[PDB]
Ligand binder design. Structure first.
Ligand SMILES: [Cl-]
Lengths: 123, 118
């Protein structure tokens, strides 16, 4: 399924030309994507966003729990886990949820990324 | 360097016995290692730990910043980032620091894994 191919293609697209092409193929040209509430539209914007992630990081890895029906609405969602290494050498992780909708052709037409609130501070 | 080979060997060891054997080769038989603030000793205990990580998880990936000298003592340390998928399907992340000591022969003789105080 397109949603199940997404994360591995995203990670492979950092270094792989064909994987990048396949990654873009998962999406409708009119994809609406949201990053912590900020909405973006279209394939040009999407390609620019993916390319930005790859220039920002020397390495990145995504793991996901599995796409399940959202409690409310017509969407599917999954928990995800990210680890990476910045272009500056430092490392990081992130946890969150992605929420998505497919069209009748099975292409991704909506994809929202919601990073969790963090709890690094302990005092 | 043995410490620079550690992380990628660790991850590759989940699916390749040659990587596991190379990983084990980095260590002194006198390895003292610390997990969750609890100390263990010896290569047998070390092998059992690595094997447990791979039964506990379907997948695991480690990223590290780079091994640098510690503020005090003769150890080296690195920040690390881990993401994984549990045997139960759930996913997780963790951040922390590893602190290591090499013996005179360059083998890992002390390794403390120190997850962040979150
Ligand atoms: Cl599973």
């Amino acid at each position: 399924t397109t949603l199940d191919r997404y994360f591995d293609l995203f990670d492979a697209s950092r270094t792989d030309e064909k994987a990048f092409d396949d990654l873009i193929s998962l999406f409708s040209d009119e994809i609406t994507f949201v990053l912590n509430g900020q909405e973006q539209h279209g394939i040009d914007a999407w390609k620019q966003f993916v390319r930005m992630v790859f220039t920002a990081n020397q390495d990145i890895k995504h793991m996901y729990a599995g796409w399940v029906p959202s409690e409310t609405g017509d969407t599917m969602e999954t928990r995800w886990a990210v680890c990476g290494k910045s272009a500056d050498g430092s490392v990081f992780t992130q946890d969150g949820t992605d929420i998505a909708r497919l069209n009748a052709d099975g292409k991704i037409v909506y994809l929202a990324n919601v990073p969790d609130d963090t709890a690094m501070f302990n005092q």
